[PDB]
């Protein structure tokens, strides 16, 4: 009832997203929480796939800022 | 019953508020002085069980644009504000080297998230302007690198 | 002067308020999405220094009393709650395994942190009761250790 | 003019003391953490070094149940 | 003439104030009178503006704080839908998990039948449920017994709604009626 | 096995570290000195996991004192909603029987989903605000440019879409209204 | 009157609603259902009374989301 | 792309859904229910056997379905 | 004929709520509660009987705040 | 033009200057008027529902006897109140029974204005005037 | 003995039995007195200071002209009033400058009582009864 | 003769500030904290014209709130 | 009679009512008034006394509120010594590690020279500092130049205590007096 | 060298450490392939490490802002403590005109350190607390067990000292004094 | 009156005080400074008033702290 | 017992001290504050040569002095 099945995997992969974001303590900054709960809340209720994965550029964008190329890159395996 | 596989070595009545009672006792002499702290080792394999998580879902989604600042990122070109999606909006990036940055600029065009964005501004490590032109193979050893790129994304 | 150092390299009036500017965005665009946790491996390192620089001072104060809770603590013997100082004041604390139950235990009288406590109870790791007489060499493997013990402080 | 030298390590000792169990966020538990500034406190305003010593026992007895065996053991090195 | 304004106090000392003008212009009176009334009328109908300006403020914010009400429960309705949708997929998932103790609960819970603490894993540990329903109550309870989450549980008690025991050769089909539903039935895990 | 239930706490893997050290150690035929030396450790580590686990059952029964307060909020909350319900069960049934006719029609308009934004004014020419969930709803009340509420009329002074996008009167037909986001704010004067 | 004290006890039941419904906690428009309850109850004119009356009613109604009227009335 | 032991990699992602779910109910505002919560999560995400995450995730669901009402598992 | 005095009770309970708020009342959170538990169960009340008996207890709350003076002067029309 | 959005900016800037500085605070208590009008409504109300309890309370209270706690409703439920004169004690008890609000209550306690123990055997018509009147009397809900 | 320790525990409880539910809310405000004695007490202290400024801006309120905010003392510092009625106009305004408060003020605009602006030139004895009083006046503080 | 009018000034302006909080003033923060802030001038003043000024701010307050109906009472003695 | 007790309400009734008693009992009236006047007189004294109880009552709590405050200030005295002895600790601390640069802050803070932000390590960094006296700002500060620290300053501007720039040239023994002290210096580290 | 100022920083270590691989890549003669691949972890390093020199640079303009908003806070109480000042001096110039001989005495009595700890009463036998700092103060007002104070005289109900410990009024002479703990806290009853 | 206007007076500048002290920190004792100050207000005895000030002005001087007299006195 | 690197053992257990008496003045007051007071220390603990843990005790000490009064650095 979400979607198609690529809907369904977007709007799964903005929760564990989410749940990242949280995890690396940036609830800390109110008014980039704030964004990042936006950008999740209309992933959500995205009815087209193509508004969903423009939101997810910019809610991932936020996690790649924080981790940085080291990270992610010992990651990529 | 199951009530005598806890509560049955030797029998009577109050001879199980009695058992209860040290029980109860025993847990709070143990727990009034207790670690408080977080196990900084665990809490350091859930976020990497959270990422992998993650990684592997993006991996599977295969999808262009997120592929594209992903791999931008394994080389330090990462986003300082949030991509933006509207026109004319105002997106800052770093580049940390010349192989990176003629492989995501061209002229005054820089191709970032399956998009096209205007460079309106570059600053390198001291905070000083640098004209595209100063932006090239040869001259490169001479910039101080790393570079903040400003650009407002094409319609 | 020094004003020159920083605000040097070609000059003029305002083209001092242009570059202070730059760099005041840049540090903005640096630090707008910036990693907000604590380096855990950090963390780790003080901890460890003021644990260190916290023994050797109590080394240097070679005081009796707090040597043998120290070496207690070190063969698993420590205190459940805060150890009082006035007399017939409660004390628990557990006791891993026979050889430090008996380097410590002698009857009914408890030595610890130069002084004497009257064991008024013991329980085991199921929270039962264990008669004094059951804790010797020769039946201790068959005790549920490790066990709790409380005394009272002795005059 | 806090005492003799063995006072003045005394008393010096029960502020890195204190500063270790903050350290090891002991601050949660309220009830706790008061019994602790308590003892730090009195030893601080102590004249006699017997006092001051009885009260560092109780202050470094909350120090060695939070710790453990194996975490003190292996920082007596 | 201005109608709702006169539960201002203002408002009435303005009406006063200005009847008197027109009576003593009526009466004919002199000129030294009717000059000292008017002064008295121009304070009254300026202390009734500055009034009639501190109410229309005092309604503003009122309209203004149901304005943003109205705004707080639209952002609700949203939350309620995000909410919804993470359920869609949370319990989509759960299905095909396919487990069955997962499955025994969430279909336990569909009929009511819900835990009042975390349900334990250990043996004779503690467990307590609501089942609203006698029809639910058989479902689940038999004898002594209690299923649930694929685990065998021991009743050790049973309460009504009113925090008051209940025997269990009470909880049958036919005395039903006579409790005071629902019940909540505590446990211990077996086996 | 079964003390594998707390597999998750850090001392646990010291603990079951300390244990195969040992059996290994005796399992090869090692000396007395080693020997003790990691039967000792063993005992240490065992000690220690005991009072993890203490405080892992302590968090527990906090997190299920926690889920009880939780109920009786719950059931407090319902108790509270009874009451609310009798109240307003009690204040209708008081309106209807003032049967005055300015009250009854916001109610009947209400009713039907017609429902004010901001307080409604009784100022001449005073702002006003109410949506409009559908068409027949505000059939049953605009009549041209006039909107007729609260035994009283107004002039509308604009209209807003579900969007917040302005709308003419003019598509707002029998069948246009499908066309249109639902509801529609209508902002009017009095007369 | 009777008409009037009619009128007047349906509003104190009526801002009790509103505080049932947490309005309090609204300061801005607390003060105003408060001052109109306040006013009702001090008018002398039947008229005055039900203007006011109609003020103070739209605010309980305008929240829609506890006033589901038609599920009342019936 | 690639498998990596499917049952227990869903096992995993539905846990962060759930403890999502119940973040979104306001679990949070009860501190020692929420951090129960958090380490029953933490421990699904670090089970080394897919029995053990799902014993776990037995005890995490029951907080979801003890919040009668707020949840509604009928309409769904 | 039972023109239904349970439904004056339950309405004149809550009037009475509002003269105890009136007075001040809530200045006493405990006494306030009990106030307010004893209002509920008047407009949730079964048997007329029981309505009464609470309407009996929250209005000992208020004549024992009046006082015997001006309790008298309101039962002079 | 927006020969709108300047006449609306004005009305805005001139109400906000005669409301800057307003007293808005109360005067002359109408709240006391308020508080009267609540009241009146509701001893009307009271005296329309006719009940026994209800105007055996009220009129105790106009004598000067008024409770002390809530009115308990449970048996054994403790009660005081205070019986301002001999009159009013005489007309409420009977031996070691008190009759409030329609109820028996089993008498307790009694104590002086000077905070003293009374035996209910001194009470009596030759020996109230010796009394330390007013009396706080406690005594439990009977059936 | 510890007879004290009896009686100190009696007084104790009845106290608390009398104050338990008892009314500790104002009545038949003295409130209102206390504002009266302290007003009596304020404008008697400003007589007794004889200062033409206060002097002015007091009997300047008594005829309806009050200020909409505080005074302000530097120069160019904005000043706003409100002016009942020709007769004060004619009184306190002489062409561009107002006289308040033993200052000068430089008279920048003047509204409507429907909040619209007025010229300086149409505020005379033979049209004022054409104008929407009071008005609000806006002046700048000279020197 | 200089009898210190200072002192009568400054004792008024006291006088003046409870006037205020009596007339709930502080209902108002901005408000009010300017007039504390005129209060406190006035107190610290080292020059009567000074002193005198601020007061004339801060009485401003005051004739505003009264208004011209209460403010003439008040005049009759 | 019954003196400090006339600022109740209730007293005045009490003491009408026992005049009007006494007054009755004078003039010999009949026992008709004379029951209805004690009557009278016996409600006003039983709320007198409820009135005296209640204040009684807030007295009390005043007292426990000041003994409060007393025992606060005892913890504050004791907080004090143990501050006062933490102080004397870091500062015989400080004496011996015999750094110049801490000594010298030290010591200018001694005279009222203290830093209004972290001193800066590197150079041309912003420093500010508060000088609270013509002699203290002789012995750190020579023409454009700062001592502190161990360290070279670069004076970038100063200001008195109003907020107002004060030249360099202003500065001196003679014109002194005519400037607002203290002086906050702002400085760029040098070298 | 200089670069070493942000030696402290995480990101630092790992800058360092890639210099030094790449540095020595190049001493050892290494190839295209790994110097090319050691330049590029160089570079990222770098961009770390510049971020985080940013942060901390904020953290401690951050800081700064602190220091300067308490200096003003300072500043403020100061002002606060001036107007207090003010105020005590104009309050006890006028208490002094008053001239009253109950208020001067507790004022003179406060001023050789006898002040109240509850509120002086005006009961007949009420309770009152003083605190006598010394045995100087103690004889002017204490003669006996009669107690002098407010123009009034209270009864001695009880003496405590400074470690709560009671007292008699026998041990209380000019020679013992020095024996006891001061300041003493004398209860007594109004007569 | 004269001495009587004087004392009033006086309770308004030391009940200031008390809250520039910040007693109204502590409501129990805030009402009953405010109490004693309305009664000194509203007396019309001259020893009524001095009675109530010996009360109100021996708060201020508990407050050591925040009195030292012989200082102000200088 | 034993030295170990006197001097900057020294500066190390003053820093120590240093931030105590800072959080007994209440420092942790002001959390921007607090943290960088609290940066401070730490790199002084963590400090390899003896020079840079000087430059951090110049910082951090500069935050106790600058707080004017609350420490009246004469009287001691």
Same mark, same amino acid.
């Given at each position: 009832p979400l979607g198609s099945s690529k809907m369904?995997?977007?709007k799964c992969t903005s929760v564990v997203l989410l749940s990242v974001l949280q995890q690396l303590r940036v609830e800390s900054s109110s008014k980039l929480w704030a964004q990042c709960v936006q950008l999740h809340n209309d992933i959500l209720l995205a009815k087209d796939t193509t508004e969903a994965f423009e939101k997810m550029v910019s809610l991932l964008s936020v996690l790649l800022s924080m981790q940085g190329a080291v990270d992610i890159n010992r990651l990529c395996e | 019953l199951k009530k005598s596989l806890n509560v049955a070595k030797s029998e009577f009545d109050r001879?199980?508020?009695?058992?209860?009672?040290?029980e109860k006792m025993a847990d709070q002499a143990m727990t009034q002085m207790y670690k408080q702290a977080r196990s900084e080792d665990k809490r350091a394999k859930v976020t990497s069980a959270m990422q992998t998580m993650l990684f592997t879902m993006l991996r599977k989604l295969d999808n262009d644009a997120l592929n594209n600042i992903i791999n931008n990122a394994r080389d330090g070109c &990462? +986003?300082?504000? $949030? $991509? +933006?999606? *509207? *026109? #004319? #909006?105002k997106l800052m990036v770093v580049v940390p080297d010349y192989g990176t940055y003629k492989n995501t600029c061209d002229g005054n065009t820089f191709t970032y998230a399956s998009a096209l964005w205007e460079i309106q501004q570059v &600053?390198? #490590?001291?905070?000083? $302007?640098?004209q595209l032109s100063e932006i090239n193979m040869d001259n490169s050893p001479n910039l101080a690198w790393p570079l903040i790129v400003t650009a407002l994304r094409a319609n």
């Open positions: 369904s995997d977007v | 001879d199980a508020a009695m058992q209860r009672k040290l &990462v +986003p300082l504000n $949030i $991509i +933006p999606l *509207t *026109t #004319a #909006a &600053v390198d #490590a001291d905070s000083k $302007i640098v």
